Predict the 3D structure of the following.
Amino acid sequence: VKEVDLRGLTVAEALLEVDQALEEARALGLSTLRLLHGKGTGALRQAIREALRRDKRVESFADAPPGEGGHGVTVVALRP
């Protein structure tokens, strides 16, 4: 499953990359995209989840389960 590593980016850089990664994932015809943002302060997770709520390319999203990244990865189901 396509995964983009956003760890180490500011919120602004991370959101710019998320926008690009969603564009590319839909361009490629992918059903799912993993956003590896890590845990830490949670600032990336929170900002990314809110961006995804507003994003018309997204069908649904959720934290990865424990053992697959947990709350450090947001798993995105893309609109076809």
Q: What stands out?
A: The two ends are 16 Å apart (CA to CA). Residues 11-27 form the longest helix (17 residues). The chain has one domain: 1-80. The CA atoms of residues 6 and 17 lie 8 Å apart.
